[PDB]
Amino acid sequence: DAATILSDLSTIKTDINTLTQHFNEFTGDLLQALAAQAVEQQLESDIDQATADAKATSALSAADSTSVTNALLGLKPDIVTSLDAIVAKKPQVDSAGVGSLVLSDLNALQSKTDALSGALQDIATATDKDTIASGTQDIDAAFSSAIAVFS
Numbered sequence: 001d002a003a004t005i006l007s008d009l010s011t012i013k014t015d016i017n018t019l020t021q022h023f024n025e026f027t028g029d030l031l032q033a034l035a036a037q038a039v040e041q042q043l044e045s046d047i048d049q050a051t052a053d054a055k056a057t058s059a060l061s062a063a064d065s066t067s068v069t070n071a072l073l074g075l076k077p078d079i080v081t082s083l084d085a086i087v088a089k090k091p092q093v094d095s096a097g098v099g100s101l102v103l104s105d106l107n108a109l110q111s112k113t114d115a116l117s118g119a120l121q122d123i124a125t126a127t128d129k130d131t132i133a134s135g136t137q138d139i140d141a142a143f144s145s146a147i148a149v150f151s
């Protein structure tokens, strides 16, 4: 159902922007890291939910493919902003001693995001599939950048 996927993608967007707020307020305190991690785990769950919902949906109509494609691609700048915000806080991450947690989260989120993109590509129109794939290459490149910073 396209509406469920759109709802799922909106929730993902909200999760990401909440996570960015946590990053921007992070001063290297472990309780802050824990609070942020709770949001990150909600985000993982919400991405996986979207993947499950996409896998349960049949080939999208033209308008539904456009809606889902634009909703997925609309995530891109918020993702980049979020990754930039945690990258900006590397000194505080290292001070807190939680670099491996950030790295583990980045790897899990990239894998889950890639699975979601694959599931949406499979039900999109042929043209939208190419658009989603190109956008996903950019998302993957941003993940790879953040991962490099933290390893």
Ligand SMILES: CCCCCCCCCCCCCCCC(=O)O
Pocket: 016, 019, 022, 023, 026, 032, 033, 036, 037, 040, 075, 079, 082, 083, 086, 093, 098, 101, 102, 105, 106, 109, 113
């Ligand atoms: C489509 C998903 C996009 C996600 C982009 C943001 C990825 C952030 C991953 C790092 C999470 C780290 C959370 C706990 C550690 C901390 O905040 O101090």
Ligand SMILES: *[C@H]1O[C@H](CO)[C@@H](O)[C@H](O)[C@@H]1O
Pocket: 080, 081, 083, 084, 087, 141, 142, 143, 145, 146
């Ligand atoms: C690679 O991309 C990440 C995510 O946007 C940046 O934070 C990093 O500085 C580098 O440009």
